[PDB]
């Protein structure tokens, strides 16, 4: 074929891997958000118990 095809394949696979890392990192950040929310929830729940 030509070295251009294989170079483009390298770069497209690299782009795909970068997208995969970005989206997985986004999943983990969203999990951070959920842990955020639930921790805040339990803390505020204990606070509400005492205040009530």
């Amino acid at each position: 074929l030509t070295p251009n095809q294989v170079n483009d394949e390298l770069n497209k696979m690299q782009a795909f891997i970068r997208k995969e890392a970005e989206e997985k990192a986004k999943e983990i950040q969203l999990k951070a958000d959920q842990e955020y929310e639930i921790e805040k929830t339990n803390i505020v729940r204990n606070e509400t118990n005492n205040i009530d």
Binding site: R18, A21, E22, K24, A25, K26, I28, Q29, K31, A32, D33, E35, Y36, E37, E39, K40, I43, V44
Partner: peptide, 21 residues
Amino acid sequence: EIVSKARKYRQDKLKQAKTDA
């Protein structure tokens, strides 16, 4: 770098949970 930034944002989410609570 992107995964490390994501983990840093994770720890920031924890600290943000503290502050927002």
